[PDB]
Ligand binder design. Structure first.
Ligand code: CDL
Ligand code: PLX
Lengths: 57, 69
């Protein structure tokens, strides 16, 4: 009582119901380093301008 | 002559006091900026001297046609 699969059936993406737990870290990755914190606060004008040699702004 | 052409000495006194304060703050800021630049170029954890890396959004997290990878 076997029915041969039709065209386009054996190439289907099928669901699988299993009991094996999903691996937490299959790549065995390390701990990612902490990034640079942030840019915080509002922008205030530069103190005493450019402060480049004799220029006052 | 003093009444018509010149002013009191307190005016020049306070003016040069303000000028001295401004220049002292500028000198301190310049030294602090040099130190900050040195430290952040040595360590690289600051906003400046950040060199680009490879974006992680380019990686493809899909089946790769082989089980291992
Ligand atoms: C001559 C070439 C050298 C000077 C160029 C002009 C200065 C430009 C400049 O960079 O100013 C920065 C800076 C600004 O001066 P400041 O003390 O802030 O001005 C007073 C305030 O703006 C307060 O001034 P104010 O707001 O009352 O004046 C507004 C405006 C007044 O204009 C009007 O009222 C038009 C009406 O200014 C002027 O028109 C002055 C005459 C120009 O001046 C300097 O840094 C001095 C150094 C300039 C020499 C640089 C190298 C020279 C090389 C050999 C020459
Ligand atoms: C009394 C008689 C016997 C004694 C004579 C004494 C001779 C003294 C006269 C000679 C003057 C010397 C020239 C020095 C000019 C100084 C310029 C400057 O310093 O003055 C400014 C202002 O200038 C003055 O108003 C004088 C300007 C007049 C320029 C003199 C030129 C006169 C020469 C004559 C030329 C004749 C031309 C003929 C055409 C045919 C001041 O700036 P200001 O920040 O505002 O004021 C600060 C003081 N406050 C705040 C208290 C007011």
């Amino acid at each position: 009582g076997w029915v041969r699969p039709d065209l386009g059936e054996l190439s289907k993406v099928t669901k699988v119901k299993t009991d094996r737990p999903l691996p937490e870290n299959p790549y065995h990755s390390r701990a990612r380093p902490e990034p640079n914190p942030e840019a915080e606060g509002d922008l205030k004008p530069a103190k005493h301008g450019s402060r480049l040699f004799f220029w006052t702004m | 002559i003093a009444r018509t052409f010149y002013d009191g000495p307190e005016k020049n006194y306070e003016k040069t006091m303000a000028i001295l304060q401004i220049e002292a703050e500028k000198a301190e800021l310049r030294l602090k900026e040099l130190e900050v630049r040195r430290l952040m170029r040595a360590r690289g954890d600051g906003p400046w001297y950040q060199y680009p890396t490879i974006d992680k959004a380019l990686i493809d997290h899909s089946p790769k046609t082989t089980p291992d990878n």
